[PDB]
Amino acid sequence: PPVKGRATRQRAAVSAALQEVEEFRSAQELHDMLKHKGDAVGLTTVYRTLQSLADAGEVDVLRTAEGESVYRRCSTGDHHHHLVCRACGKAVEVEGPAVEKWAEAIAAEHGYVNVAHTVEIFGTCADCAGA
């Protein structure tokens, strides 16, 4: 996980933590689990590295209803949409050219120069209903 800044142990540690975690997480709870591992990193520094990862683009970023920004990394480079369960957090990556063509067609119809789509589908889990 290369970063724009000079490599060191702490960015490697947070990158490895993101690698192990395959769920949507917030910065504060990410720091909580990171401290639980025992690295004892700083809050604001963790912010810098996660922000850098979001800027780099190798980690997707989502915004919750509460307004918190949450992050998680994706195995595949190409763009995709993550279906996520609020209770579980199971993020599954899917993509469809139909929505892309729809966006381009709308942009052309309205004479828009450039666009950027943000589509996230929320829903109820299959196993959450079961008990």
Partner DNA sequence: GGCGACCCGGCGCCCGCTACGGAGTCAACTACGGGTAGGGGGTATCGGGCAACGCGGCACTGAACACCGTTGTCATGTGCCTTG
Contact residues for DNA, defined by CB under 7 A: 3-6, 8, 10-11, 40-45, 48-49, 52, 67
Q: Which partner, Zn ion, DNA, none, binds residue 5 by CB below 5 to 8 Å per kind? A: DNA
CB of 44 to Zn ion, least distance (A): 25
Residue 74 site contact among Zn ion, DNA, none (CB < 5 to 8 Å, cut-off depends on kind):
Zn ion
To the question of whether residue 81 is assigned a binding role by annotation, the answer is yes
Reduced 3-state DSSP string for the chain: CCCCCCCCHHHHHHHHHHHHCCECEEHHHHHHHHHHHCCCCCHHHHHHHHHHHHHHCCEEEEECCCCCEEEEECCCCCCCEEEEECCCCECEEECCHHHHHHHHHHHHHCCCCCCCCCCCCEECCHHHHCC
- Select 3 or 54, whichever has its Cβ closest to DNA: 3
Check whether 36 is labelled as a binding-site residue. no
Choice between 41 and 71, CB closer to Zn ion: 71
117 annotated among ligand-binding-site residues = yes
What is d(CA 83, CA 14) in angstroms, rounded to the nearest whole number?
A: 24
Point out the annotated binding site for Fe cation. Answer: 79, 100, 117
Point out the annotated binding site for Zn(2+). Answer: 60, 74, 79-82, 85, 88, 93, 95, 100, 117, 125, 127-128
